[PDB]
């Protein structure tokens, strides 16, 4: 019955595609994490310019709201999607709820790392909500990975 | 139709289109960093003005650029021509930024040097023309990667 299944594979991939776009947006916050207190050098490495991180986290925030806006535009995965959409709302929330240390002239490095740097030894100002958001997008990626693998398996199962 | 062999055309096409959508999302994230140029996080959630402190924001954009290049390096018959065209575009984006360190790599990178690097509609290039071009290669690599997947699905007839 290749008629039905043709659609089913498109639909499932469409979701997996949408999910990876959000998993990649989030990974860009991990690259932003490598940029706290850094400028560009001629050789292409990163050199230190300490404790000016206001617009770095501003863009980190900007991305974290794109993530929510992307999740919203998403069968069967309702629970794992809404659980992820709630996670990204509490990442934006915790960032915006910390302006007094993330929203000033000369945002320091220390409180910058506390917001977008995973495994930061000192999670206080948003990282925990980001780590929890990374795990939440894994369970959803795997769910939509398996969801599409199931529609391909329908091809061959007698 | 060779039903087991038609899959693993779909699977492999899927995998590439995924990894291709990955680098688009990283591209699209740079546009989010272009909205942050000379901005700060406010209480109500909006972006309030804080000009001329932009060094770290462009270092963030720069690392995304070398992740884009690395991703395209880990990436295919009809795409080998389009993969290398995209990868090459992403290295001239990473090279126009470092070649401009004195403007984009100093304490107090001004709002207007940043809008010539990652902002697409500026009046241009510190990096933007290589960005707009990189975004061009990817959009045609994605078209190719999409057509590869549609051709595999099509083989089921």
């Amino acid at each position, epitope marked *: 019955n290749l008629t039905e299944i043709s659609k089913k594979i498109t639909d499932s991939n469409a979701v997996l595609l949408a999910v990876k776009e959000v998993e990649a947006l989030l990974s860009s916050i991990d690259e932003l994490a490598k940029a706290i207190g850094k400028k560009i050098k001629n050789d292409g490495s990163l050199g230190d310019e300490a404790n000016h991180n206001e617009s770095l986290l501003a863009g980190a925030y900007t991305i974290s709201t794109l993530i929510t806006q992307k999740l919203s535009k998403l069968e069967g995965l309702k629970e794992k999607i809404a659980a992820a959409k709630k996670c990204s709302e509490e990442f934006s929330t915790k960032l915006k709820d910390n302006h007094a240390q993330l929203g000033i002239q000369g945002v320091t490095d220390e409180n910058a790392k506390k917001a977008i740097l995973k495994a930061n030894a000192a999670k206080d100002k948003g990282v925990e909500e980001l780590e929890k958001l990374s795990g939440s997008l894994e*369970s959803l990626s795997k769910a939509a*990975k398996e969801m599409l*693998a*199931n529609s391909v398996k329908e091809l061959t199962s007698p | 139709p060779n039903l*087991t062999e038609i899959s*693993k055309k779909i699977t492999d096409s899927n*995998a590439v289109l995924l990894a291709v959508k990955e680098v688009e999302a990283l591209l699209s994230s740079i546009d989010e960093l272009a909205k942050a140029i000379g901005k700060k996080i406010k209480n109500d959630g909006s972006l309030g003005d804080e000009a001329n402190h932009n060094e770290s924001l462009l270092a963030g954009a720069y690392t995304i650029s070398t992740l884009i290049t690395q991703k395209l390096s880990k990436l295919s018959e009809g795409l080998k021509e389009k993969i290398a065209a995209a990868k090459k575009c992403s290295e001239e984006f990473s090279t126009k930024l470092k070649d401009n360190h004195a403007q984009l790599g100093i304490q107090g990178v001004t709002d207007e040097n940043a809008k010539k690097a990652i902002l697409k509609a500026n009046a241009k290039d510190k990096g933007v023309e290589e960005l707009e071009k990189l975004s061009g290669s990817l959009e045609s690599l994605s078209k190719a990667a999409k057509e590869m997947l549609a051709n595999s699905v099509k083989e089921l007839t």
Partner: antibody, heavy 123, light 107 residues
Framework: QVQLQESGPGLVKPSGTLSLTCTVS?????????WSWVRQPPGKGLEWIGEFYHSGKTNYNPSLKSRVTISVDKSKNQFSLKLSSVTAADTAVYYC????????????????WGQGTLVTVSS | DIQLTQSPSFLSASVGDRVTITCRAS??????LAWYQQKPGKAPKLLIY???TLQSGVPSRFSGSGSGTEFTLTISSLQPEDFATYYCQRLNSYPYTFGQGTKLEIK
């Protein structure tokens, strides 16, 4: 931290129904993966019995399709296997297993097994 | 079925020797094949999936390769802890047929 454990009567009388249960720590059969039963008669090779996905879909080995049932206790994080009208040819070490896509996208590969329980059929 | 024919049923080898086990599928199954090592009275361990991909943990000395139809498992060098029965599996469709096994004795 995935673990699988089989349990049930290691002795079944001919023409009876064979019952086993798999208990899963470290994972949730409700959240995903495929879960299956495999059987190996002593000194012999491996035979697959059936599989299920939390979505409801259930598939069985056509050589056993007449005499097999698999059930899910989502509340107990457990699934069972029901082989009816058994003979001595069904004397085997029985495994529950988990299927996973691993590094790829299709198909699923068996990556976690139980320790295996031996059920001898005899009167 | 789309049966699977594992070519050597039994095998003797010495520590350091090279060993090759073969798997013939009667139809093409792409690369949807897996190799398991099973030591006596234990569940099968998984070595290789997608017919060349090495599962984590497994030593690099193991390796696989195969076309749509014919597959081989190679262990480069050898060690007395590779005494086991080895199995094909075909995962493209059910009933996920296992091979018939290959007993491997060390000399």
């Amino acid at each position: 931290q995935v673990q699988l454990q089989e349990s049930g009567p290691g002795l079944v009388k001919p023409s009876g129904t064979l019952s086993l249960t798999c208990t899963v720590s470290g994972a949730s059969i409700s959240v995903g993966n495929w879960w299956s039963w495999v059987r190996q008669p002593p000194g012999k090779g491996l035979e697959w019995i059936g599989e299920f996905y939390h979505s409801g879909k259930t598939n069985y080995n056509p050589s056993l399709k007449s005499r097999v049932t698999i059930s899910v206790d989502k509340s107990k994080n457990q699934f069972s296997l029901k082989l009816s009208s058994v003979t001595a040819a069904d004397t085997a070490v029985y495994y529950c297993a988990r299927s996973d896509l691993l590094t790829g996208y299709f198909p699923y590969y068996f990556d976690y097994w139980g320790q295996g329980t031996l059920v001898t059929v005899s009167s | 079925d789309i049966q699977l024919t594992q070519s050597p049923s039994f095998l003797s080898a010495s520590v350091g020797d090279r060993v090759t086990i073969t798997c013939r599928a009667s139809q093409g199954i792409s690369s949807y094949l897996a190799w398991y090592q099973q030591k006596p009275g234990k569940a099968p361990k998984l070595l290789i999936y997608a017919a060349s991909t090495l599962q984590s943990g497994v030593p690099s000395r193991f390796s696989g390769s195969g076309s749509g139809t014919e597959f081989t498992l190679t262990i480069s060098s050898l060690q007395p802890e590779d005494f086991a029965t080895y199995y094909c599996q075909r995962l493209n469709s059910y009933p996920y047929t296992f091979g018939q096994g290959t007993k491997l004795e060390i000399k």
